[PDB]
Amino acid sequence: NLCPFGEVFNATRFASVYAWNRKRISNCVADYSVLYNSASFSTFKCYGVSPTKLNDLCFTNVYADSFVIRGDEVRQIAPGQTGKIADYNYKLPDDFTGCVIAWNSNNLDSKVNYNYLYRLFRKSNLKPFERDISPLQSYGFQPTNGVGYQPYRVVVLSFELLHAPATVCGP
Amino acid sequence: VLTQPPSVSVTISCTGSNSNIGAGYDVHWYQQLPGTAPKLLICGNSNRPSGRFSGSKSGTSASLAITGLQAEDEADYYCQSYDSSLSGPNWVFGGGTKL
Amino acid sequence: VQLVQSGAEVKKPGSSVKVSCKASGGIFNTYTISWVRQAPGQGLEWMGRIILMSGMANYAQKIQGRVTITADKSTSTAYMELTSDTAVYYCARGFNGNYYGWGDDDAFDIWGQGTLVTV
Ligand SMILES: *[C@@H]1O[C@H](CO)[C@@H](O)[C@H](O)[C@H]1NC(C)=O
Secondary structure: OEOOOHHHHOOOOOOEOOOOEEEEEOOEEOOOHHHHOOOOOOEEEEEOOOHHHHHHOEEOEEEEEEEEEEHHHHHHOOOOOOOHHHHHOOOOOOOOOEEEEEEEOHHHHOOOOOOOEEEOOOOOOOOOOOOOOOOEEEOOOOOOOOOOOOEEEEEEEEEEOOOOOOOEEOO | OEEOOOEOOOEEEEEOOOOOOOOOOOOEEEEEOOOOOOEEEEEOOOEOOOOOEEEEEEOOEEEEEEOOOOOOOOOEEEEEEEEOOOOOOEEEEEOOEEO | OOOEEOOOEEOOOOOOEEEOEEOOOOOOOOOEEEEEEEOOOOOOEEEEEEEOOOOOEEEOHHHOOOEEEEEEHHHOEEEEEEOOOOOEEEEEEEEOOOOEEEOOOOEEEEEOOOEEEEO
16 A cells, blocks of 8 residues: 555646645555656755655644646745745744655746736745645746746655544555 | 866956856865875865865855965966856866965 | 775877776765866866766757767766867766755866876
């Protein structure tokens, strides 16, 4: 019983950053070997845990939050960061534990792409994980842009450990 | 390429663009003594490894501050940052300043 | 951590060279190896980086098509090889003090000795 990472990383449709969706993964084998050894990833950064130890530790559950953003804002999906996305679309908690995975999706998402939206105007700051749907602007991703403008698909795997059986373990 | 003064007698400047420094990407600093590989002195905006130095960013520019004319640290100083243009990820080192 | 590179060598111009680099220190926090070169009297130029886990590598556009980097997990080495200058080629591990793994805002902290290749 392997965890449904394919439903997170091999999905055809991704949420926009202003309205990111998520999957809750539990009661399965979290074989992370599939992800950290993947040649599709441009970046992979973990907070509080080394990637090579992910298969040696258990969680109550994990949350896979996924969305598409422009490449030069990939650095904002981290604790302690600021910026329009960090502040008004996906607030990443400063005590975050988990891994952030991202890759270049230019060959899937760009168009010769008025689909993915992010916030421009938000009256106040978000608290961690508080997605809000209600102002918004299209990225308009193109096939002929630099890496900072090309779309990067992002998956954030947060790790939750509670007074629970801890059923999400690697091999 | 990041622009730097050929030499400084103090502070070492590093000027880029909004595709690399004004982009918000971290600017790291190195000290290269002749005969060997460069040593990192600043990581991120202003963190440092064990073993006098500070720095900051402003707009599309960044700078390294070295205080005290100690010994003869006539090293070649370089700035490094991630460039988000071209057609793919690349890292850029500055021209290099002789101190 | 320690990164040991190859010694100096001379090749005929137009031929190929293979430069090794072995991260013998530990390899426990090393996820990626980057290569940087420095021509005599010049500054440093990034050439490429390989992620040891995935085997994928990115390259500077100016040398694309004439450079390859191979990660051999079994020996903890990264091979930098070129086809068809007299620059010194340095091996360095990527590192960031804020997180484990690799990314764009990381830095080259531990550098090898530098291998020169001339014609
Ligand atoms: C996604 O699909 C590729 C095949 O195209 C496969 O190699 C990879 O392991 C899959 N990723 C996940 C998380 O299942």
